[PDB]
Symmetry: C2
C-alpha cells in the first residue's frame, strides 16, 4: 500500500497520519523531522589575506648615478634619488659628496601566514537538500536518512521511504558569499584582478599555493631623510585586517527562519521554510485485518479537564466494551485537536485515557478509537503563563474555529435582526399584492 | 579610455569596432572569438555497471534436510530441494534414496570490471562560461583568456579586458545526464535504490569503490533434474549491456546550434547562442593625436569590380594626397559593407586598395580613412557556386529597406499613380468649393 502525505519542515514537531486500507484495521503512523540540511554547491573564486611588504637593503652609489630596472613582481616600484649624503654610526658613508645617489625598491608578496589565516570568496549555485526523519512504524522507532529531492529511495525494515522534492528552494545564502573560519557572510566581494586599496580583496590569489598574485596597495616610494639610509614609503593598510574588525554580524545570527549556519562544509540547518512530501511503501505484512482487530462498542467520552497550554495538557477518558483483548490505533477526526497517543491497548470492559492539545475555546471534536467513533466536548481554560520555551503542538485555528459555544449569542442577535427583515419584507409584499389587485 | 562593444557569440568570425576619442586619430580594433566554453557543474548520483552472479558449490545432505540461513548480500536467495538423487562420473553420489535434500544459494555482486567499464549518472546544476579572445591591439595579435561572467578581468599589454556576462544561459545539457566515455547522453536515469531489472541502473553504487551495492535482477533458483548437480536459475540479463547496444546517437551529434561535446571534464564547446559583451580599457599611450597623424585630402574612390558573395569578393581603390607620411585606421560607415583590412599606410599621392564583403546587389557605402571620408558605389555580380564550406562574412541578408540600383522604375510607377490621385482629389475639391459657394 502506497501512502502519501505532506508535513511542515518545522524541526522537532511530530505529525500523525491515518492510513485507510479497506478490509484492514486503520493504521496510524507518526513522523518527525530531526534535522533538515540545505547544502549549497560552491565554486572558489579567490583567496584573500594579509599582504607582506618586502623592502630589500637600499643600494647606495658613493659617486655616480644608479639606474632602476623593471621587474614582474606583483606591485614592483623603483626610484633613484640624488643629492643624498647618508651617515653611518662611525661617520659619513663615503667621500665624494656631489653625486652620491641612492636606489630604492620595493614589492608586495602574500604573507606566509595566509596558510592558516585567510578568507575565501565563493560563488553559490544550487543546493542539495537532505533530512533525517524518524517514523513510529509498527510500534517501533526507525530512523530514515535520505536526500530530499524525490529521487532517493531508502528501505528500512521493508518499507520504501521517498523524501522530497522540497516545496521551496529558498536559502539563507546569497549567490556570492565569503567564508572565514566558522563565520559565513553574504557580501558582494569585488571581481578578481580588480581590487582596491584598504578594501577587502586588496590582495588576491586563486589558490593558497598559487604563485600568481594580484595586489593593489598603491605603494609609493619616498625620498629618505638627509643623513640616513632608511627607505620611507606610503602604502594602504591591508583591507583584510580592516574587514576582520568590521565584519559585523555573521549569517548564523542574521538569517531568516531561524537557520543555523555551519562551515566545513558550508551548510544551512533546520530552516523553517515550506513543507516536505513523504511517500511510504507499506508491506501487507504490516496490516491487521478487521476480523483480527478488537471491536469496540458502547463507548462514551468524558473530558474532566481542558487547558489550551499547547503542552497536551488536555485530558479525555473514553469508556469502551471490547469484544476481545488486543490493540487499536487512535486518531483525531479534526485538525483542531491533536492526540498525543498513537496506539492504545484495549481489554474487556474498561476505560482509556488520552492527552490532547488544542487552541479551541470549546473542545468539540470526534475521536476514532479503533473502527468506531466517540464524540467529546469540553469548556477549555487559558494558561497562566505568557511565555514558553517550546513551539505549540496545536495547529492554527481560523475565525470560525476559535468560537466558543457561547457564540449562541451571535445566532440569537443575528436571528432577531433577520426576523425583523423577514417580517418587513412580508408586509411590503402583501401591500404590493393588494395594491395591484385594486388598480 | 573605456570602450564597450558587443559581438555575436560565434567562433572563427572577426568583428570590427570603432573607437572614437576626440582629439585623437580614430582607432579600429579587430576582435575574434577562438573558443567559447560552457562548463556545467556536476554532482555524481551513482555508478552503474555489469553485475556478476555467483553460485557456490551446492550442499548435499543424503540422509536429512539441509537448512537455510539468510545473508545481507546485495541480492541473495536460498532454497532447499528434496527428492534429489545426484550422479557423478563413477556412479551415483548419494547412498540414501530417501530424505535426500540439496541446498542451493546464489548472490549478485558488482563485477571487478566495473572499475573500468561503467556509466556515471550525474546531476547538472549551472554552468560557468569562459572564452579565448583574439584582439588586434595596436596592430598586434594578443591572446586574452578570461571567464565570461563579467568577472576575472585580465591585463594584456597594459589593457584590461572584461568579458560577459553572457546574454544567454542556455545549455545543451539537461538536469540529468549520463556519461560513459566521450559520449554524454540526456537520459532520465532512475532514482537511486530503486532500479529495475533488464534496464539501465539495475545495479547501483554511490562510488566505484563502495561496498554498498543495490541490485534488482529477479534472481530465482530452480530445481535440479535428471540426476545432475547443477544449480539452474532464472535471471534478467544486465541492463548495462542492453543500454550500451541501444545507446543511440549521443549529444555530440544531436545537440543544436552546432555545439561540440567533450568529456573529462564535461564541456559544451562553441555553441552559437546569444552574444558576448566586451569591455576594454585602452591606455592613453595607445592613442595618437590628430596633429601627429596624417590627414588626407583630395580623395576619390573607384570600384574595379564587385561580387555580392562571401570571402570579400569585392575590391575598391581609393586615391589620396598623403601629406605627412604615416599610417591610419580604415572603417566602413555602414553595416551593409564590411572592409577586411583594419588599417592602411599612406605615402605620397599613391592609391590604397582594400577588399570588401557585402550582400548588396548594388554597392553603396562610405569609407573613412585617416579621419576623412569618400563615397564608393558599384554594380555587383552574383556568385556561381551555390554552396560553400565557410560562413558568410557579410553582415546580413537583403531586407525590404535595401534594394539594387536602377530602381527608378519603382519611383516612376509610384509617382505616376500618386499624381493621378493628386489630380483627381484637386478636381473634386474645386467642384465642391463651387457647390458650397451657392446660396
Ligand atoms: C521514540 O523515541 C522517543 C524518544 O525521544 C526520541 O528519541 C531519542 C533517543 C532522541 O533521538 C530524541 O531526539 C527523540 O525525540 C519517544 O518519545 C517519548 O518518550 C520519552 C521517554 O523515552 C518521553 O520522555 C518522558 O520522560 C521524561 C523524563 O525522562 C519526561 O520528562 C517526559 O515528560 C516523558 O514522560 C518523551 O517526552 C516522549 N516524546 C514525545 C514527543 O512524546 C517515543 O515514544 C519513542 N517511541 C517508542 C515507542 O519507542
Ligand atoms: C595578426 O592576425 C592575422 C589573422 O590571424 C589569422 O587568423 C587567426 C585566427 C589565427 O589563426 C592566425 O594564426 C592567423 O594567421 C594574421 O594575418 C593573417 O591573416 C590571414 C587570415 O585572415 C592569414 O591567412 C595570413 O597568414 C595572414 N595574413 C597577413 C599576414 O596579412 C597574422 O597573424 C597577424 N597579422 C598582422 C596584422 O600582423
Ligand atoms: C457577542 C459576540 C459579538 C462575540 C463575538 C466574538 C468574535 C467577534 C471574536 C472572538 C474570537 C475571535 C476570532 C479569534 C480567531 C480568529 C483567527 C484569526 O486569524 C482571524 C480572526 C478570528 C476569526 C477572530 C474573529 C473575531 C472573533 C470570532
Ligand atoms: C519591384 C521589385 C524588383 C521589388 C523586389 C523587392 C525585393 C527584390 C527585395 C525588396 C525588399 C527585400 C526584403 C527586405 C527584407 C527582408 C526580410 C528579411 O528577413 C529577409 C530578406 C527580405 C525578405 C528581403 C528580400 C529581398 C527583398 C524582398
Amino acid at each position: 500500500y502506497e501512502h502519501v502525505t505532506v508535513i511542515p519542515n518545522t524541526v522537532g514537531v511530530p505529525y500523525k497520519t491515518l492510513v485507510n486500507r479497506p478490509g484492514y484495521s486503520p493504521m496510524v503512523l507518526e513522523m518527525e523531522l530531526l534535522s533538515v540540511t540545505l547544502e549549497p554547491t560552491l565554486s572558489l573564486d579567490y583567496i584573500t589575506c594579509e599582504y607582506k611588504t618586502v623592502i630589500p637593503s637600499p643600494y647606495v652609489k658613493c659617486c655616480g648615478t644608479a639606474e632602476c630596472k623593471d621587474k614582474n613582481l606583483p606591485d614592483y616600484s623603483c626610484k633613484v634619488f640624488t643629492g643624498v649624503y647618508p651617515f653611518m654610526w662611525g661617520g659619513a658613508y663615503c667621500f665624494c659628496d656631489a653625486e652620491n645617489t641612492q636606489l630604492s625598491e620595493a614589492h608586495v608578496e602574500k604573507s606566509e601566514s595566509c596558510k592558516t589565516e585567510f578568507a575565501s570568496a565563493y560563488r553559490a549555485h544550487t543546493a542539495s537538500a537532505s533530512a533525517k526523519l524518524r517514523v513510529l512504524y509498527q510500534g517501533n522507532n526507525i530512523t530514515v536518512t535520505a536526500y530530499a529531492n524525490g529521487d532517493h529511495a531508502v528501505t528500512v525494515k521493508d518499507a520504501k521511504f521517498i523524501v522530497g522534492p522540497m516545496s521551496s528552494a529558498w536559502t539563507p545564502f546569497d549567490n556570492k558569499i565569503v567564508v572565514y573560519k566558522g563565520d559565513v557572510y553574504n557580501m558582494d566581494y569585488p571581481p578578481f584582478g580588480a581590487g582596491r586599496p584598504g578594501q577587502f580583496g586588496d590582495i588576491q590569489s586563486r589558490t593558497p599555493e598559487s604563485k600568481d598574485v594580484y595586489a593593489n596597495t598603491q605603494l609609493v616610494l619616498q625620498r629618505p631623510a638627509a643623513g640616513t639610509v632608511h627607505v620611507p614609503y606610503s602604502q594602504a593598510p591591508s583591507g583584510f585586517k580592516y574587514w576582520l574588525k568590521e565584519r559585523g554580524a555573521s549569517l548564523q545570527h542574521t538569517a531568516p527562519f531561524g537557520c543555523q549556519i555551519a562551515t566545513n562544509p558550508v551548510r544551512a540547518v533546520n530552516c523553517a521554510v515550506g513543507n516536505m512530501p513523504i511517500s511510504i511503501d507499506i508491506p501487507e505484512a504490516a496490516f491487521t485485518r478487521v476480523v483480527d482487530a478488537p471491536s469496540l462498542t458502547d463507548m462514551s467520552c468524558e473530558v474532566p479537564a481542558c487547558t489550551h497550554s499547547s503542552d497536551f495538557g488536555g485530558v479525555a477518558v473514553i469508556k469502551y466494551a471490547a469484544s476481545k483483548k488486543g490493540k487499536c490505533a487512535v486518531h483525531s477526526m479534526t485538525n483542531a485537536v491533536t492526540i498525543r497517543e498513537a496506539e492504545i491497548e484495549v481489554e474487556g470492559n474498561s476505560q482509556l485515557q488520552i492527552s490532547f492539545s488544542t487552541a479551541l475555546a470549546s473542545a468539540e471534536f470526534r475521536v476514532q478509537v479503533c473502527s468506531t467513533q466517540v464524540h467529546c466536548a469540553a469548556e477549555c481554560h487559558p494558561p497562566k503563563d505568557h511565555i514558553v520555551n517550546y513551539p505549540a503542538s496545536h495547529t492554527t485555528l481560523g475565525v470560525q474555529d476559535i468560537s466558543a459555544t457561547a457564540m449562541s449569542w451571535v445566532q440569537k442577535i443575528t436571528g432577531g435582526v433577520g426576523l425583523v427583515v423577514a417580517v418587513a419584507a412580508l408586509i411590503l409584499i402583501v401591500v404590493l399584492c393588494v395594491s395591484f389587485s385594486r388598480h
